[PDB]
Symmetry: C2
Subunit: 130 residues, 2 copies
């Protein structure tokens, strides 16, 4: 299936996905300061995004998309909107509106001597249309 095969994608890969953002991690937060150490992750799927009952499983069911820095979070969402209620409305989690994203497979090498580095999907582009 697509998410299992996407999870095998090598660093450098760029994919266009269409569907819905069905969740974020962490699901609650109050300011940009929450993301000094913690990372904002989005969950994306075009497979039964609606069904209540849905148990998300990143890499089989949906993909995890990291927004890697506070600066990138701000660029996309604005520092003034960086509370989970507001990001939720912006990402249309409670609405049927479809989303299109370009994601990029990056080597995400965290802090100093690493964590170590891991391969993750990061948000290249996002359209709240169409």
């Amino acid at each position: 299936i697509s998410y299992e095969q996407l999870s095998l994608a090598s660093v450098g890969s760029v994919e266009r996905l269409e569907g819905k953002i069905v969740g974020m991690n962490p699901p609650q937060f109050a300011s940009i300061n929450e993301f000094k150490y913690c990372t904002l992750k989005l969950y994306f799927t075009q497979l039964l995004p609606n069904v209540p009952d849905k148990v998300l499983v990143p890499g089989v069911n949906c993909i995890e998309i990291v927004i890697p820095t506070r600066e990138r979070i701000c660029e996309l969402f604005g520092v003034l909107n960086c509370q989970s209620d507001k990001i939720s409305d912006i990402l249309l989690l409670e609405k049927p509106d479809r989303i299109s994203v370009e994601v990029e497979r990056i080597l995400w090498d965290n802090d100093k001597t690493a964590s170590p580095g891991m391969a993750v999907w990061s948000l290249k582009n996002i359209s709240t249309d169409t």
Copy 2:
């Protein structure tokens, strides 16, 4: 037990595995309070005898193990020890010594705040032995 089979495990599954905690997320932190919204995750794998070594891809290359609550973090590690440097020492991430973990597939939900639950591996037991 392949990683693929581990990614498909039904909620409630328990597994005893041996290998190494090779990293933690977040990889740097100062106190327990950083885990109010953020979740501590550990990365488990079996290590390479005489080879590299490196790019973790959770679910394919290793498993991510979540310690779902602050209460659980303290119970295992101690509120006094909840700094990334101290936990790294406790988890022996810089010694070659093998670790033994028991993980449980849990439905992790999750404030229940227009969120969905996620199936994840939770730390049931760990031995440094």
